[PDB]
Design a binder for this molecule. Structure first.
Ligand SMILES: Nc1ccn([C@H]2C[C@H](O)[C@@H](COP(=O)(O)OP(=O)(O)OP(=O)(O)O)O2)c(=O)n1
Ligand SMILES: [Ca+2]
Ligand SMILES: [Ca+2]
Ligand SMILES: [Ca+2]
Ligand SMILES: [Ca+2]
Ligand SMILES: [Ca+2]
Length: 897
DNA sequence: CGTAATTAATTAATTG
DNA sequence: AATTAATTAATTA
């Protein structure tokens, strides 16, 4: 096997690299790297180096890395360009690994942990860390073992050792229910006093120093606390042992009075899972407590205990230690399903960057292009300073707010990455400019042809057609990877619906789940055996098919997110290849591509229907159009269709056979008209929406831009077993909206599109009657807590203070005195509830941290004054009024006249 | 230190 | 109430 690195850092003029050799063992080294930088030189001088624009460069090899740093400083005030990779560690990895890396994750020591700290004077701040650490659970990837460290004696209580026998027992039995699969993998370690626990953990840390370190909030709590408590006990230099190189940095955050810090251990790539999640999950959550996320991702129970958390050890020490392990493990379950760690490594290595650098797409693309160019002996241009500027983006069409019965959408395959490829947009493929006609003259094909030599964009930019640019070439590779993983995801999706269609009639047999590969569609062979399967074996097959989908999803969505970020990065000033001329060239083309095809599709469906100038494209957004199919089903008659599925198959066949060839005819012409490099505007059909055949439902509606819902039967190949709702932008998809309300409105949309006006009315009074009996947390609103510092004038709402902050400033006065109350963290998310006028809180609403039940001392007083009539009108009624008024419907039958 | 476009619910102020 | 403008938080792409 080939060699690969694990972690890379720079300390002085020396690079510290932990790696895996050709045999497959862990080795650490220290190299006096000699970095080379570049500068422009005389025309007539034979050398093998050129900058990206083609101009020659002379190589300056430096004796050490300070000499290379010094050199750039001098080059600046003198006024010359210092070309080459100035982030030197990357230039080390590009040399020491001149090939495409193939890592073996089993060799990479991934470790994730969590600690527990008992604090009876408030929330234990990691910066002070004046309280004892009374637990640590620390998993290892190569050991496959849970290393539990239990403190039995502390000046906050002395507790009997943790029973592994009780731990295994079920919750309902009196136990803690630690999943039996890991129970044999726990290696329990209790301790006499605090100091001797920490000493052992460090030896273990040395013997088994992590390469990837993770967990839940480990960066903002665990690591900060571990380091700081050791600083208070063993010293700073003994705490510096957490880095396998001894070097560590401390970053302190603001903050008027409150001090929070983030520690940087050199030689360990830290990826905090909470970060990973927000970045790669594509879910905006109400709460980011480990409990809530596990509930959401794994449908597992919630960690139930009595008393505040600061007193849990005292009473239920058994559950305290047990729950600690579960936490450490729950993350591992989230990753087995989500596979973000795998993604971090897939990306990190392909880019040749520190693994924690995957959070930065600019740092990612800078390494990808540098390595792309270096093999061609080209030299990267120096990073410049730019003023921040707004620039035009995507075109969004204004729809007529209305119901729409039959709808087919048509979407562009990875649009912005495609335009880069079609036009050949790169920093070095720029030719010049041209006279820009109104965008509309290009949309209507009436303006003069921009170029007969160059590839052009309606933002007035010409690009070379001869040899490929470095960006289009680099984005293609990653787009191809993205694609492969999507074709997987889509199968596991299609195969999910084959299991669900068959689950209609499950057999009362005793059979077992077939061993099949879910990334590829079931053959009409395996399909037939599924139709004979037990309900037991069908549901287990469905799980497997869905987990495959998730895993596939993660791969394809974040590879997408990555390449889209490159397009966006051209608009961020810190990106080495920042160029508004290029970013606008993309977006502007996008605007033309959509509005051009809006014309073309309308022009076709008039020529097919023999009609003259009627509208069919009703709404468009960035890269997709929505086509009304009313006239199509009208022309063949509603009477003629056997079942709902029959007209779906008919529109399916129509869109693929009659439309797409005219759509691809239209995009080929636009290519000619723009004299582009390559035609890459592929628009296939996406969703097929409509009511159930012979039902009262309305199909779909629009309430305006970026807000609508659809009854979708087919979603780009996946024929759904049960009709599925596509809701975009409505309060059902907004995290701020209460869970009970999200659920309720979704049933309203469901009945609107599927069952008719009459159905809506019946359910509306069904809900209004159940509302006042529902749990507060479910019916409470959510919002982020930004700028709470500003609107606070020593308590009480300031000038123009937002509704939620107003609510928080209520909380602070209520918990004035109570230490056993959770503090509202700036940036964190909170629940918001409106009180009635005349309450012990002296305000119109209150707010408290998300996830957590509101502290005992005020909880009673909140429910004692909650304004349900307002909460219902605000969250539920007003948005539904929005839906029905834009759909020509009534939710509550008129009591008047 | 990836992006823009767009919404709805706020509030402070003015509708003689 | 009902307009507008200004601000915040959240979407869709
Ligand atoms: N976070 C995002 C997502 C969207 N867009 C741009 C890039 C896309 O090209 C275009 C359309 O986005 P889509 O949601 O339709 O995703 P793609 O077209 O990129 O991929 P797919 O082929 O799956 O539709 O909008 C963007 O700039 N940044
Ligand atoms: Ca905990
Ligand atoms: Ca798309
Ligand atoms: Ca698509
Ligand atoms: Ca069956
Ligand atoms: Ca789309």
């Amino acid at each position: 096997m080939k060699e690969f690195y694990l972690t890379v850092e720079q300390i002085g003029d020396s690079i510290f690299e932990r790696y895996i050799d050709s045999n497959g063992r862990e080795r650490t080294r220290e190299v006096e790297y000699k970095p080379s930088l570049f500068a422009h030189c005389p025309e007539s001088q034979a050398t093998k180096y050129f900058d990206i624009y083609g101009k020659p460069c002379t190589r300056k090899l430096f004796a050490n890395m300070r000499d290379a740093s010094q050199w750039i400083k001098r080059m600046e005030d003198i006024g010359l360009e210092a070309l080459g990779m100035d982030d030197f560690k990357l230039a080390y990895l590009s040399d020491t690994y001149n090939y495409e890396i193939k890592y073996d994750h089993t060799k990479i020591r991934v470790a994730n942990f969590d600690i527990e700290v008992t604090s009876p004077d408030g929330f234990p701040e990691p910066s002070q860390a004046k309280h004892p650490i009374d637990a640590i659970t620390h998993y290892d990837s190569i050991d496959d073992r849970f290393y539990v460290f239990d403190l039995l004696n502390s000046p906050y209580g002395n507790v009997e050792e943790w029973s592994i026998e009780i731990a295994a027992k079920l919750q309902e039995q009196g136990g803690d229910e630690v999943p039996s699969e890991i129970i044999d993998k726990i290696i329990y370690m209790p301790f006499d006093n605090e100091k001797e626990l920490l000493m052992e953990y460090l030896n273990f840390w040395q013997q088994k120093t992590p390469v990837i370190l993770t967990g839940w909030n480990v960066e903002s709590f665990a690591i900060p606390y571990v380091y700081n408590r050791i600083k208070n006990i063993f010293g700073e230099s003994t705490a510096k042992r957490l880095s396998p190189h001894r070097k560590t940095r401390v970053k302190v955050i603001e903050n008027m009075y409150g001090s929070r810090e983030i520690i940087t251990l050199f030689g360990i790539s830290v990826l905090d899972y909470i970060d990973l999640y927000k970045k790669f999950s594509f879910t905006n959550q109400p709460s980011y407590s480990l409990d809530y996320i596990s509930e959401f991702e794994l449908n597992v129970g919630k960690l139930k205990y009595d008393g505040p958390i600061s007193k849990l050890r005292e009473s239920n020490h058994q559950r305290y230690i047990s729950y600690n392990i579960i936490a450490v493990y729950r993350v591992l379950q989230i990753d087995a399903k989500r596979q973000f760690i795998n993604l971090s490594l897939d990306m990190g290595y392909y880019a040749k960057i520190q693994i924690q650098s995957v959070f930065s797409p600019i740092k990612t693309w800078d390494a990808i292009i540098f390595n792309s160019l270096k093999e061609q002996n080209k030299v990267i241009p120096q990073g410049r300073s730019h003023p921040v500027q707004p620039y035009p983006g995507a075109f969004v069409k204004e729809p007529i707010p209305n119901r729409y019965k039959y709808v087919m959408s048509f979407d562009l395959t990875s649009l912005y990455p495609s335009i880069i490829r079609q036009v050949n947009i790169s920093p070095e493929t720029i030719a010049g400019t041209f006279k820009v006609a109104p965008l509309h003259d290009y949309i209507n094909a009436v303006a003069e042809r921009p170029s007969d030599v160059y590839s052009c964009s309606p933002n007035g930019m010409m690009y070379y057609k001869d040899r490929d640019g470095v960006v289009p070439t680099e984005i293609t590779k990653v787009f191809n990877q993205r694609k492969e993983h999507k074709g997987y995801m889509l199968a596991a999706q299609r195969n999910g619906e084959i299991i669900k269609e068959a689950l209609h009639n499950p057999n009362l047999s005793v059979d077992e789940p077939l061993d099949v590969d879910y990334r590829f569609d079931f053959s009409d062979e395996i399909k037939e055996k599924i139709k004979k399967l037990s309900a037991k074996s069908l549901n287990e097959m469905l799980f497997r098919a869905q987990r495959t989908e998730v895993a596939g999803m993660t791969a394809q969505i974040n590879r997408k997110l990555l390449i889209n970020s490159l397009a966006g990065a051209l608009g961020n000033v810190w990106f080495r290849y920042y160029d508004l001329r290029n970013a606008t060239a993309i977006t502007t083309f996008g605007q033309m591509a959509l509005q051009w095809i809006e014309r073309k599709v309308n022009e076709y469906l008039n020529e097919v229907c023999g009609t003259e100038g009627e509208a069919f494209v009703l709404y468009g957004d960035t890269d997709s159009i929505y086509v009304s199919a009313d006239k199509i089903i009208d022309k063949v008659g509603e009477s003629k269709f056997r079942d709902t599925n029959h007209w779906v198959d008919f529109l399916d066949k129509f869109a693929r056979e009659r439309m797409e060839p005219a759509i691809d005819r239209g995009f080929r012409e636009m290519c000619e008209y723009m004299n582009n490099k390559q035609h890459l505007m592929f628009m296939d059909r996406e969703a097929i929406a409509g009511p159930p055949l012979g039902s009262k439902g309305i199909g779909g509606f629009w309430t305006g831009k970026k807000r609508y819902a659809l009854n979708v039967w087919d979603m780009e190949g996946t024929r759904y077993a049960e009709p599925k709702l596509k809701i975009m932008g409505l309060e059902t998809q907004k995290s701020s909206t209460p869970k009970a309300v999200q659920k309720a409105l979704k049933e309203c949309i469901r009945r609107m599109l599927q069952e008719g006006e009459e159905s809506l009315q019946e359910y509306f009074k069904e809900f209004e009657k159940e509302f006042r009996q529902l749990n507060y947390i479910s019916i409470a609103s959510v919002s982020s807590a930004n700028n709470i510092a500003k609107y606070d004038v020593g308590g009480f709402p300031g000038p123009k203070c937002p509704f939620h902050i107003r609510g928080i400033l209520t909380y602070n006065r209520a918990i004035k005195g109570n230490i056993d109350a959770p503090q509202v963290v700036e940036g964190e998310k909170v629940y918001v509830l409106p009180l009635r006028e005349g309450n012990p809180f002296g305000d119109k609403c209150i707010a408290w941290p998300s996830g957590t039940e509101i502290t005992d001392l005020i909880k009673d007083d909140v429910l004692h004054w909650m304004d349900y009539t307002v909460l219902l009108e605000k969250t539920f009624i007003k948005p539904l009024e929005g839906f029905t008024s834009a759909a020509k419907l009534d939710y509550e039958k008129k009591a008047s006249l």
